[PDB]
Every structure is written in C-alpha cells, then in structure tokens.
Write a structure and sequence with these properties.
The structure is a homodimer. Chain A is an alpha/beta fold. The first copy, chain A, has two domains: about 130 residues, Aspartate Aminotransferase, domain 1 (Alpha-Beta Complex); about 260 residues, Aspartate Aminotransferase, domain 2 (3-Layer(aba) Sandwich). The first copy, chain A, contains ten helices and ten strands. In chain A, strands 1-7-6-5-4-2-3 form a seven-stranded mixed beta sheet, sandwiched between helices. In chain A, α7 links the parallel β4 and β5. The radius of gyration of chain A is 22 Å and the shape is globular. The relative contact order of chain A is 0.16. At the A-B interface, α1, α2, α3, α4 and α5 of A face α1, α2, α3, α4 and α5 of B. Chains A, B: Catalyzes the decarboxylation of L-tyrosine to produce tyramine for methanofuran biosynthesis. Can also catalyze the decarboxylation of L-aspartate to produce beta-alanine for coenzyme A (CoA) biosynthesis. Chains A, B: One of its GO terms (molecular function) is aspartate 1-decarboxylase activity. Chains A, B: Belongs to the group II decarboxylase family. MfnA subfamily. Chains A, B: It catalyses: L-tyrosine + H(+) = tyramine + CO2; L-aspartate + H(+) = beta-alanine + CO2. Chains A, B: Its cofactor is pyridoxal 5'-phosphate.
C-alpha cells in the first residue's frame, strides 16, 4: 500500500500483477455480453510493441508514426466516402465527439464576434439517445442542448429537428449511426438535408456503427431503414472507433472532418505560448488502425461483421422461441431484452457469470454480440436466463 | 491510400509499418534532447501485453485492473504524503489538469447556485509559465484567467497572488512544481498558505517534477529554493505524470485529490442517462504505474533521478566552459541555453541530427536530460553546437 525504499524482483511484481489480472474477466471466456470492446486482432500486439515508444504529441520526432496516423485517417475517410478528410486517431469516441463539439462551438464563437448570433451559448440539437460523452461536452463547454425526442423505432424525430431549426437559431445537429442502447440508425440523410439547407453543422456519431454499417450483407438490412450515414451525405464530421468494431487496442478512436478547412476551428489561442484535446498521446493507435484495415481489407471485415450479425439473429430467434421480448429486431449486432425486473435479472445473471449491460431509454438487458460471442455462449446464456425466470 | 477489397499478409503489413518506424527517431539513439518522455522501463512491455485487453471505462468487468489503478493512486499518494488521496491514472497530465479545472469550476458552480459568487465565470490565478493544457481548459470551459507574472528566478510572484486574492474573488490558484520551460518550482508553500487562509482551491501541476523532486539528492538542491510541493502543504490536487519521469508507457498520467470529498465535484449530470474525461480507457497505465514504483522502490527511482541530475550538471558545466549562457543554474533535469538566434540554431541542430525544443518565456534552446541522455551524447551535442557557432 505504501511506497517502499527497496524494490522487488521482476518475478515478484509480475506474479502479483497476474493475480490481479486473474480477477478480471476475459473477452474470450463467455462471460462478457454487454461490451462494445472485444479481443484485439492478434497482430496488433506486435504493432503496440513496435510503436510503444512513440508520441503523436511530438510528431516532429516521430515522422513515420505521424505519417501512419495520416494514412489511418485516409483509409477511414475512404471507407466513409471522403478522400480529402482531415482528422486524427485520438483516444476514443469521447475525445472525438468532444472535438466535434469544440469545432461547433468555435464556429459559433466566430459568428458571435461578428454579431451574427443571438445565442449566448451554442444551441445544439441532440437526440435523447446520445452517448454520455455529449453530456460531458455540454457540462464542460457550457453548451445549450435542445433534446430531440425519438420515434417509435427509437430513431430521432426528423420533423422535430426541422421544426426546431425554423423556431430557433441552431448551431449544430447531432445524428447517431448506431445508438449505444439499441444499435439504431438516425435518418442522417434527412438530417443532412435540413443541415445543408439551413447552413448548420452536422456531426454523425458512428463510434460503433461506422465500422459495422459499411460491411453489412443485404440480408441483414431492413426495408425502410436508411443505412446512409457518411460523407456522401455532405456531413461535417464523423466519429468512428477502431477500438470497438475495428479490433484495435485501446486507445484507438477516430474523428474525421469533411476537409482541412475545419482545422482552424480546432485552434486554441495561447497568449503566452495542436488540434487534439490530449497532448502526449499514443502513436500505436494510428499504426494499428491502418494495419488492421490493410490486413483485413473489406473482405476480412465483412466476414467478421456478418459472423456477428449471424450470431445476433441467432440470439434474437432463440429469445423469441423462449418467449422473451426483444425491444426491436436488431439492426446492428446489438439485441435488447425487455424486462420490468431488469436490474435484478442483471444481478442474477451476474451471480451466474453472465455480464450484460442495462438500458436507459427502456427497461431492458443489452447484449452486444461482438466477435467473442459464439453460438455456444448464446445457448449458455439462454439456459441460465430461462433458469432465472423459474 | 484507399481501402482495398483484399487483405494483405502479416509479413507485408508489418514490413510496411517497420519502414515507417525507421523514419522515426528513437530515444536511445542520441538524437532526442528536448522531450520529457523517454524509453520505458523494459518490464512495462510485458505488463502492456498482459493488460492490453482491459478497459477501465468498464471496471465491473475488470475488477483486478481496477484494484491496480487504486493501488497505483495509493502509491503516488504515499509518495506525495497523502494516504487518503482520491484519484485516477488517466491519459496524461493534460487530462489530469482538465479534471482539476473541472473540479474548480464545479465548486464555483455550487457557489453560484447559492448566490455566493459575483463571478460570472470561475476566476483562476495561473502563472504565465503554465503548460498549454491550461489554455485548452480555459478555452473549453470558459474560465477567466488572471495571469500571474513571474519573478527574476522565473517562479510565480507570490505577492501578486496575495494581492490579487484581496482585490478579486478568486476561485482557484495554480502552482507549478517543475515548469515546462525551465524546471523551476513555484513557492507552493506560500501559495498554499494564501489559499488556505482565503478558502481557495489550489492545484499543483507536478506532471514532470512530481517524480523528480522527491528523489533529489541534497547536492542538487539549491539554497533558498523550496522543494515542498505536495499534500503535506494541504493542497487540493496534484497532477503527476508516470509517462514522463516514471518510465511508464503512454498513456500513464495521474491526478490526485486531497480526499474522496472531491469526487462529487467531478460528477456530470445526465438527465437521460464516471469522473474521468475519457470513457473507454486503458487499464495498463495503472498496472505499469504501480509495478514500476514497486519494482524500483524509492532506491531505484533515486538512482535514475540523480543520474539524470549528474548529467544535467555536466551539461551545464560544459556549456559554461564553452561560453554558452544557461538561462538558470538547473533545478531539475532541464537546462536552457540563451540564444537570440535560437530558432535558426534549432533548425541547424536539427539538420545535424540534434533535436532540441525551444522556449516561450525566453529566447533559448531547451534540453531535457532524460535517462536516455548520456555523457557521450552531451559531448556530441557540445561539439555540433560549437561547430554551428563558427
């Protein structure tokens, strides 16, 4: 507990650490059902070792690692239909979303300086399904949120957004491509039309879905769901998270802006003295993001994505066969189970070694069918749950 | 450049990555003289591998890794003379400083809600030597900074701070234990007295110095410099950065608060739904911080710190012997060289394979004598610099 004068041997300290690691769950063991992280692609362990002693906060010392960040951003941009994207491989979707909010706020600040805004704080339309990082941004940056309601399919109400844009002076719109709770996709096509017609910045949070949606086989796509979400719609920025469905080690997050014109709105003016929030920051995230996308190609990511979707629809089928009520038919590799007693059922599952997460907008257990979840784990989950219900 | 359909082999992608890594500098090669990062302790490569697939954003899944974060914070707290510290192993000193600023701001918000503050924004006294992360915080959180001037020894003017606290309603004070530019130590003892007498929060930025000052041999200590900076002075929070002079891999930063009473001021209220800014975040930083401090003990860190100081004073001696003007006699393992033509000299050094950094408050080259800088590198640096000056 206290700092000691004498050191200890490598064997002593590693064995102590391994005992603590033994208390953790491991993704490959069939315990973790509620996480959007999973096992990393094995090749990334070598890449982390190669790039461990780099620092993208000092890119003049690590020119090659910096070029790899640029290449990683370019490959993500290509995936998102934008060959000119300006962006960064950052610490995660939270920092990515915060940087988009900073950009929105600095566009508003410039208007305020010119007398072109009656808003004392940026006014941003955000769906109530938005990830908690948006609340962190609101709280830090003193943003004003207009919370948009969701429709019966749990996607943002586009008519509300359009009406709010007419009623108020709006500084940004947020749409979500793959919501945290249910994996639904907002109508980005319509939101982007509203945004373009009114000269409003629009950010797409595709932290999870950005590395799933582009790879979905047609049989998993649903009539009337629009899967368009990327720069082909003219959106201003997109968050996308390699350390979720990109199989990259933490920290590997992505923020892409439509072009380099946005970089100036990420400036910070220091009277007595970088676009990311962090300073010193890893170089291995960009190396891993580039390398995993190159190693797998579209073919390899498609195989993983649709294996997850196969197991997602298997879980959905088994749930209904056992008279459980999924909240929705799954869109991405996320299924939620309606249950009034969800808190207690979650704890009972936990006692039996099944770790799910629980929802906010609805009383349900959330299962994220990442690549570590196999058929036998789903079968095991159903047995344990049936047993709890007797 | 573009996303491809077909993947590539492991050999192809690793060889490509290794070519980019070949363009980087490496700490052990005698090129990097201006960085506060260095080679990691070799044991940490194994720890990163063990803990790569953990996530302190989901500590309920990684109970052991979470306990190790708590143990890492406790060891840092013990080093800083506080057995009850509440804190986190975060992404770096930037996030640490931002969390301290969030705490300061939320203490002010509570006062504002009760009518106990005439300040429309928190008013924080910050020395002009403060790290750029404080400007990032000001810009994001709409803080009002009262910039404190520095004295001839480049430390904060304590009388200015005391006078400003009488003239204005002040919500926080920042002191620096190891400035970025010169390695000087503000008079934290006096600042903490001012802060306590006026009920003002005080944060100490010891990102660099916190893992140097406690280990300095008496011969490196200077008459009249006060080396006290930690919780024995009753300060409210301290930033300390293991991935600087703690030899830990990025990301390993530290933020410690005086006690768990501060946790409530890091809350974020989400109407429709964690104390760190990041969400998903590494677990290996806490494991490495704990393990390196246990492995080295005070004895092993003292040896490294004072080896760096030996080489720092060697560099200072050689500089004067060659008629260069150091800005100050070094306090920590940082030396700066006065030069009117510092920008051009820096570029000339760069052309010769010597990478220094350059200062803000003064026209000088900054050398950070990290453990990778040995006598032969200092001798080589002096030769190249003498040559540039002819």
């Amino acid at each position: 507990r206290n700092m000691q004068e004498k050191g200890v041997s490598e064997k002593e300290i590693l064995e102590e650490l391994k005992k603590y690691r033994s208390l953790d769950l491991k993704y490959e063991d069939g315990n973790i059902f509620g996480s959007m992280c999973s096992n990393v692609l094995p090749i990334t362990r070598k890449i982390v070792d190669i790039f461990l002693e780099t620092n993208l906060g000092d890119p003049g010392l690590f020119k090659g690692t910096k070029l790899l960040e640029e290449k990683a951003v370019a490959l993500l941009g290509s995936l998102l239909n934008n060959k000119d994207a300006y962006g960064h491989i950052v610490s995660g979707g939270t920092e990515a979303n915060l940087m988009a909010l900073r950009c929105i706020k600095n566009i508003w600040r410039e208007k305020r300086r010119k007398g072109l805004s009656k808003n004392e704080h940026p006014k941003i339309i955000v769906p109530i399904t938005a990830h908690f990082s948006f609340e962190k941004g609101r709280e830090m940056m003193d943003l004003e949120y207009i919370y948009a309601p969701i429709k019966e399919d749990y996607t943002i109400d586009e008519k509300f957004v359009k009406d709010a844009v007419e009623d108020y002076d709006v500084d940004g719109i947020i749409g979500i491509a793959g919501t945290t709770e249910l994996g639904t996709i907002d109508n980005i096509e319509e939101l982007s039309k509203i945004a373009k017609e009114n000269n409003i910045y629009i950010h797409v949070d595709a932290a999870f879905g950005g590395l799933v949606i582009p790879f979905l086989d047609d049989k998993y796509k649903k009539k009337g769901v629009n899967y368009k979400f990327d720069f082909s719609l003219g959106v201003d920025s997109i968050t996308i998270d390699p350390h979720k469905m990109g199989h990259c080690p933490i920290p590997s997050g992505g923020i892409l802006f439509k072009d380099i014109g946005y970089k100036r709105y990420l400036d910070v003016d220091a009277p007595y003295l970088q676009a990311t929030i962090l300073g010193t920051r890893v170089g291995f995230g960009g190396a891993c993001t580039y390398a995993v996308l190159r190693y797998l190609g579209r073919e390899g990511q498609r195989k993983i994505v649709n294996e997850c979707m196969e197991n997602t629809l298997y879980l959905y089928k088994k749930l209904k066969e056992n008279n459980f009520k999924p909240v929705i038919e799954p869109i991405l590799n996320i299924v939620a189970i309606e249950d009034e007693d969800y808190k207690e059922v979650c704890k009972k599952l936990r006692d039996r070694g099944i770790y799910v997460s629980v929802c906010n907008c609805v009383k349900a257990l959330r299962i994220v069918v990442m690549p570590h979840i196999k058929r036998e784990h789903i079968d095991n989950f159903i047995e344990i749950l049936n047993s709890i219900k007797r």
